[PDB]
Each structure stands twice: as C-alpha cells, then as structure tokens.
Design a binder for this molecule. Structure first.
Ligand SMILES: NCc1ccc2c(c1)CCO2
Ligand SMILES: [Cl-]
Ligand code: NA
Lengths: 305, 305
C-alpha cells in the first residue's frame, strides 16, 4: 500500500544525455542513433536573444563550432540542421546506448518524467504534468535547457518534452522532440506570460480513486450527479470540463471500487463547494491533479520496465 | 525556479537489481560486485513466519536452492551467508554495471530515493524520508521486498535502505545494507506497530527557507523566539525537538536569505497557530517535512529572489 508521486526509472534516458556547447553557451543534448538534439537557442548570444533570425545565426556556424561531450569523450559533429525550435547535430558515432524509442507529442493533462540535467549530467528525476495552459511546474536552474521529459511503455521510451525556458511566474515552457512548442510561446526574450491555468478534473477524480483504494474514504457520499450538472460546477471552480471519454477512461476504477464516476463527481462537487473540513486525502490538503487514470492503475498494479 | 520532490537518477541502481527465488517466494536482490543482497525472510515458509529460526532455516539450504536471475540470465550462487537480517549470496559473476558505491546507515529526517522493483525489474522512483518513528511512507506492493533506497551525492551511490515489510498502518520498515533494522522492528509476522510519528522540524524550516529563496515571504513576521520557547510550543503540535545541531545545520540557508534561524522558528510558530488562511507555500497547503537542509541547497538557486 501507499501512494507516491512516482517517476519512471530514468536509466534508459541517462545513457542519452550529452553536453552541447556553442560559444559561451553550454546546455544539454539528447543523443540518439547518430543525432544530438538540443534547443536551437543554443546558437544565440544575449543580443540575438531579443530578436533572433535563427537561419541567419546558423549559417555562420561550422560543425566544429558545436562542442559535444558524452561523459569525458568528445563527439565529432559532422552535420547540423534545424527542425522547428530544435537543432539536430549529426555526429560520427551512433549512441551505443540508444534505447527503443519514439517521439510523441502529449496532450494537456498527461504526465511524464523529467530528467533534470546540467552540463550533460543527470541531476534529478521528477514527475510533471502538461498543464492545461501548456506550461509545466518543473524545477529548473540555469543550465537545465535541453533536459527532457518522457514516458516508458513496455521497453520503449516515448520522448515528449525538451526544456527551453522559464516564464516570469517561475513555470516552464518547452517543445516536443520535433521542436514544436507546447503552448503559445516562442524562443526569444520578449514579453511572455503563462495564461490562466485550470485544474485537470479527470486527474483529480483518478486521485480520489487512488485514495479510496488506499483506504481514504471519508469524502464518499450517497449522492450522484449528471455530466451537465457537474460540468457547471467544474466551470465555476475553474476545473476542466469532464467529457464522456474521461468517464469511460475511469471505467476500470469505477468498477474496481464500486464508485461510479458521477458518484465520485458528487464527492468532488461537495469537496469543491465545502472544502475538506480540516481533513486530508492521501496526505494532501489540496486536491491533487497530476496523476492520470493510467498512473493510478499502474502504481496500484506494480507494472515494471 | 520551482520546487519539486526530486529523486536521484536511478540508472546506476537499475543495473544492480536482480530477482531472488527461494522455494515459492520471489523478491528483489541487489547485485554489487559478486554479491547479491536480499532480505533473509526469502527463506521463510508459510508456517515459519511468526517465529522463524533463520540460522536453522539457512543451514538446510544449498547454494543451488537460490535462483538468481539478472535480466534474462541465471547467475550461479557459489556461497551464502547471513548478516543480521540480510542474506548475502556470493555469485560467480561480478556485476559489470556495479557503480561506485558505499553502504550508509541514515538517521531519522534523512531523505533518499526509492527504486520500487518487482521481480527484479524497476517500476518507478520516488523520494522518501526516514520518519522519526523509523518507518518510511512508501509505495510498495507485494513483491517489492528487497527494493532499495539510496542517494547519489556526486558519482557514488550510498545505499541506505532495503525494504522488508509493511506495518498495519500502511507504512514501511526495513534495514540498512548491513541488515540492521531501522527502529524496533523484527522480521517476524508477530504484531508490531509504529510509534506515534512526529513532524521533522528542521526539514520544515529548510523548506520555508526554500520558499524564501524562490521569492515568497508572506509567512514571515516581526518576531523572534528563544530555542527553548520554540520547542515548548512546537512539541504541542507533535513536532520533533529542534536541537542546536539543527540550528547550526540551518546556518548556510539563514545566511543566504538574511533570515536568522530563530526568526524563521518564530514564523513556523505562527504558521502552526494560524494555518495558511487559504494561501500555499511552494504549492502546498501543508507544511512539508521531507526536504532536508542539504536537499534545499542542492535543488535551489544560490541567488535568492
Ligand atoms: N525565450 C526563451 C529563450 C531562452 C534563451 C535564449 C533565447 C530564448 C534566445 C536566445 O537564447
Ligand atoms: Cl543521516
Ligand atoms: Na456519491
């Protein structure tokens, strides 16, 4: 028993992290087969940062301008190109530690593990969710750009995030591994802000099921509700709308615990309208929304990688 | 910016996890050099759980009674010995993936990463603290025994915990890697119960310093306290006593933020009296006690906001 915010084991990704230096700028790269991926803003000085022309900045660069270190071994860059906001550095050696992998783009509300890295060395791992406002509430210091996020399904690593920047509120923005930003952000120093965030309803429900499975039941009640009724409540409390597909995804947990989703929606309605009355749920005084239904099932089932 | 419960990258430990089978029982083992460490209760049978005599159970075993599987490979057991509550199986292959490592016994309040494993395969990684009552609040299902906890300050893995059992309240008990239990617990199924747990005061103070470093000051006040008056108050809320050692340990964070340790104690006193009045600290509505002073310094910027 027990329920913890849990990251995937990070070993398969640790073996892919390299250090990329261009000029005075050092950050992290992802080395897979014979390509190192990193943010294209690595090629900017701080003046270009204000309004960069990335194709122009890249023309000046020769392969030898990119210093890439894998541990204490240098990698020789033999080609370079840009895809959206990522730079792709062709190297002369395929990574012998390349795992089975795919590039995937995730949806807001989905969770993933972040391997935070500095100078090509993994420093920590934690679990994140893509917020509805397309930021992530990460923990990142200067030098962490190019750190990546991922999930593991079977033996295949699905890379979903590469870290690019921090917004003024201290939350974080980045791209998928094809260099498309999550959210309405751009890689330059201009005025940018996170939009108003909302709470991930299906994830809060999943976490209430996790609580019940772990013996925390005080919030259960006799009442049920309807989607249209609940979604009016959700809107009022800045929760994402709950869809029928969300209800279906929670089906397993409803059958396992004997609490139908709209039964649990009635619990959540009452929590939103009245608070927790001094109690906690799974050790939290807040409603937790960064566990997906799959996360709850997986941790309450013991799946391995 | 940001502040997360952050585990160490798990890859160095992942490459040490094996499966140990004795009879009908399978759990996890830790393979370092040519030795596999696992809980000695793997040799218990179903009527041997209340008062097992481990010396008598072990003398009846031959090396080939121990099945050790490392990934797809069977390891050959060529010797065995018991040390306190751990079994040490000598095998005929040194683990080629053995990291630099040491065995460290930790004190209550210390944090570490847990690599949850089932059948020798890692499932996930999360952060735990050794509670004042010598339990940990983990996430462990049947088959998780022999999972380990560790830190990796620099490049050396300090192994500090091996999981043995779950107590009636759902919390977890285990040993150091020399097989000595944390707390008054024994590897018998006779009824035992964790002592009343308390809050790790020095860690809460660390986390409040983390909140100031990341730019939040709302909970400070104009007051101070003597160390003894602080302790007289905090023990009425089930907080651990704060010692001069703890005050010394917090010196660096005090210097970085400009807030004297006993002034931060006065802030904590008021937080216990008032609650948070609808506010949060580093995203939490409760006072967090599983970040040590060392953790905060490792994760936070060196420049206060
Ligand atoms: N706006 C994120 C960002 C961060 C660094 C950097 C750039 C953008 C361009 C030059 O270097
Ligand atoms: Cl310690
Ligand atoms: Na109900």
């Amino acid at each position: 028993s027990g329920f913890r915010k849990m990251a995937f084991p990070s070993g398969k990704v640790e073996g892919c992290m390299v250090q990329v230096t261009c000029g005075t700028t050092t950050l992290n790269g992802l080395w897979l087969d014979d390509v190192v991926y990193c943010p294209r803003h690595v090629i900017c000085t701080s003046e270009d940062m204000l309004n960069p022309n990335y194709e122009d900045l890249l023309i000046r660069k020769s392969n030898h301008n990119f210093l890439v270190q894998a541990g204490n071994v240098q990698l020789r860059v033999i080609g370079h190109s840009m895809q959206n906001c990522v730079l792709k550095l062709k190297v002369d050696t395929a990574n012998p530690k390349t795992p089975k992998y795919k590039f995937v783009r995730i949806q807001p509300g989905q969770t993933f593990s972040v391997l935070a890295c500095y100078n090509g060395s993994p420093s920590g791992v934690y679990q994140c969710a893509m917020r509805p406002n397309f930021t992530i509430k990460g923990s990142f210091l200067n030098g962490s750009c190019g750190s990546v996020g991922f999930n593991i399904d079977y033996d295949c690593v699905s890379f979903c995030y590469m870290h690019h920047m921090e917004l003024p509120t201290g939350v974080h923005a980045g791209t998928d591994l094809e260099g498309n930003f999550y959210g309405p952000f751009v890689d330059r120093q201009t005025a940018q802000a996170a939009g108003t965030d909302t709470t991930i309803t299906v994830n809060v429900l999943a976490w209430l099921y996790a609580a019940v499975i772990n013996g925390d039941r005080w919030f259960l009640n006799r009442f049920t509700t309807t989607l249209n009724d609940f979604n009016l409540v959700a809107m009022k409390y800045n929760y994402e709308p709950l869809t029928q597909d969300h209800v279906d995804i929670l089906g397993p947990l409803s059958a396992q615990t004997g609490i139908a989703v709209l039964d649990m929606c009635a619990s959540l309605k009452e929590l939103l309208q009245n608070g927790m009355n001094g109690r906690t749920i799974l050790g939290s005084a807040l409603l937790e929304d960064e566990f997906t239904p799959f996360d709850v099932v997986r941790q309450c089932s013991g799946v391995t990688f």
